[PDB]
């Protein structure tokens, strides 16, 4: 994979598709530049800070679209395909999948 600086990545305001009403992207869109002076590249978010070149994740519009997605060191909130705010890692209660061996 090709590393990308955090500052070179931005969040699109909404996942709604203007061309096709009733359809929205299931994963937030990302506009990013390869370097500091690099051009912006239209893309879609992936899993664990991954960036997808193709904005192909398309789903029908759904009510109650309260979703969370990772973003750098924290999460980014959404409601009805609308950006809400950044979230820190500690903002969400953590359940431990690990099994302690003291």
């Amino acid at each position: 994979c090709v590393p990308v600086a955090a500052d070179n990545v931005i969040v699109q305001n909404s996942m709604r598709i203007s061309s096709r009403p009733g359809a929205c992207y299931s994963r937030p869109l990302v506009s990013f530049r390869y370097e500091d002076q690099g051009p912006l590249v239209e893309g879609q978010l992936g899993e664990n800070n991954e960036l997808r070149l193709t904005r192909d994740a398309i789903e029908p519009c759904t009510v109650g679209h309260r979703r969370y997605f990772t973003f750098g060191g924290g999460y980014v909130y959404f409601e009805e395909y609308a950006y809400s705010h950044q979230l820190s890692r500690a903002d969400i209660t953590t359940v431990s999948t690990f099994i302690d061996l003291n």
Partner: protein, 52 residues
């Protein structure tokens, strides 16, 4: 025992991805096993939303 502890920490950090896949597959069972109480769940994206 330090080798065992290091291997156990590596095993947890290494099965974390298996656990993520299992959460994507059967969120109710995975969330119940993780929390300790039988709870219904639904992964609303990168995070899991639960309900007792």
């Amino acid at each position: 025992l330090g080798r065992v502890a290091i291997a156990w920490c590596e095993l947890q950090n290494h099965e974390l991805t298996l656990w993520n896949e299992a959460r994507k597959l059967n969120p109710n069972a995975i969330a119940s096993v993780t929390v300790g109480r039988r709870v219904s769940a639904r992964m609303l994206g990168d995070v899991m939303a639960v309900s007792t």
